[PDB]
Write an enzyme that holds these catalytic residues in place. Structure first.
Site, mmCIF file in Angstrom:
data_model
loop_
_atom_site.group_PDB
_atom_site.id
_atom_site.type_symbol
_atom_site.label_atom_id
_atom_site.label_comp_id
_atom_site.label_asym_id
_atom_site.label_seq_id
_atom_site.Cartn_x
_atom_site.Cartn_y
_atom_site.Cartn_z
ATOM 1 N N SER A 185 -40.887 49.393 -44.195
ATOM 2 C CA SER A 185 -39.817 50.379 -44.141
ATOM 3 C C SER A 185 -40.304 51.648 -44.850
ATOM 4 C CB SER A 185 -38.548 49.839 -44.801
ATOM 5 O OG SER A 185 -38.735 49.640 -46.185
ATOM 6 N N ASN A 189 -43.211 51.594 -47.475
ATOM 7 C CA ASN A 189 -43.229 50.329 -48.203
ATOM 8 C C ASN A 189 -43.944 49.365 -47.257
ATOM 9 O OD1 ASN A 189 -40.958 51.020 -50.434
ATOM 10 N ND2 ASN A 189 -40.226 51.702 -48.425
ATOM 11 N N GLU A 223 -35.712 60.371 -57.591
ATOM 12 C CA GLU A 223 -36.088 59.872 -56.273
ATOM 13 C C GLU A 223 -37.153 60.719 -55.577
ATOM 14 O OE1 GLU A 223 -35.750 57.015 -55.025
ATOM 15 O OE2 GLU A 223 -34.274 56.265 -56.440
ATOM 16 N N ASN A 239 -33.675 54.363 -47.508
ATOM 17 C CA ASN A 239 -34.513 53.386 -46.818
ATOM 18 C C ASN A 239 -34.138 53.071 -45.374
ATOM 19 O OD1 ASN A 239 -35.124 50.198 -46.273
ATOM 20 N ND2 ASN A 239 -36.790 51.193 -47.422
ATOM 21 N N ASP A 265 -38.836 55.242 -47.086
ATOM 22 C CA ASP A 265 -37.732 55.891 -47.785
ATOM 23 C C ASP A 265 -37.877 57.358 -47.411
ATOM 24 O OD1 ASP A 265 -37.111 53.442 -49.364
ATOM 25 O OD2 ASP A 265 -39.031 53.913 -50.314
ATOM 26 N N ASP A 299 -42.162 45.307 -46.438
ATOM 27 C CA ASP A 299 -41.205 45.159 -45.343
ATOM 28 C C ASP A 299 -41.318 46.243 -44.275
ATOM 29 O OD1 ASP A 299 -40.010 47.325 -46.645
ATOM 30 O OD2 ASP A 299 -37.987 46.601 -46.268
#
Length: 130
Positions: A51, A46, A35, A60, A53, A49
Site C-alpha cells: 500500500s 509500504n 506525517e 493509506n 500513504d 502490504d
C-alpha cells in the site's frame, strides 16, 4: 505544494476542521507536520502490504483511496489516491473527516500518538489568527 504553517492553519479552519469530532485545529496541524511536513505530494510505499500513504496527511490506499495497485484494498473516501496529491486539500480534508468518523479517531496515526498526543500542540496554531 509545501504549506507554510499558518497558511495551513487558516486553510484547515476554513474547511471546518477546528474541533471536528473533538479534534482541535492544533492536533490536525501536528499530525500533518509529522506525517508529511506540510507537503501535499508526499507519498510512502509500504512494501509489506503493498500500500502507499498519500499526501499531507499520508492517507493509506488499503482503506481510503483507490490507486488500483494495492491488493484487496477498499476506497472508503471514494477518491482516486490522485486526489490526495493535489495542491488544493479540500478532498484530503473531506477524506480525513471520514477517517475520524471511525472508532480510533486520530489515534489511527502512530505519528499523532508519538509526537502529538499528551503534548502541547498550541505552538502549531500560535500567531496564525485561527
Amino acid at each position: 505544494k509545501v504549506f507554510e504553517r499558518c497558511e495551513l492553519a487558516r486553510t484547515l479552519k476554513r474547511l471546518g476542521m477546528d474541533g471536528y469530532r473533538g479534534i482541535s485545529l492544533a492536533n490536525w496541524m501536528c499530525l500533518a507536520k509529522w506525517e508529511s511536513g506540510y507537503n501535499t505530494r508526499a507519498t510512502n510505499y509500504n512494501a509489506g502490504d503493498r500500500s502507499t500513504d498519500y499526501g499531507i496527511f499520508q492517507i493509506n490506499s488499503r482503506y481510503w483511496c483507490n490507486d488500483g495497485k494495492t491488493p484487496g484494498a477498499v476506497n472508503a473516501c471514494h477518491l482516486s489516491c490522485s486526489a490526495l496529491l493535489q495542491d488544493n486539500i479540500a478532498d484530503a480534508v473531506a477524506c480525513m473527516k471520514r477517517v475520524v468518523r471511525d472508532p480510533q479517531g486520530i489515534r489511527a496515526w502512530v505519528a499523532w500518538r508519538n509526537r502529538c498526543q499528551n503534548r502541547d500542540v498550541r505552538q502549531y496554531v500560535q500567531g496564525c489568527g485561527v
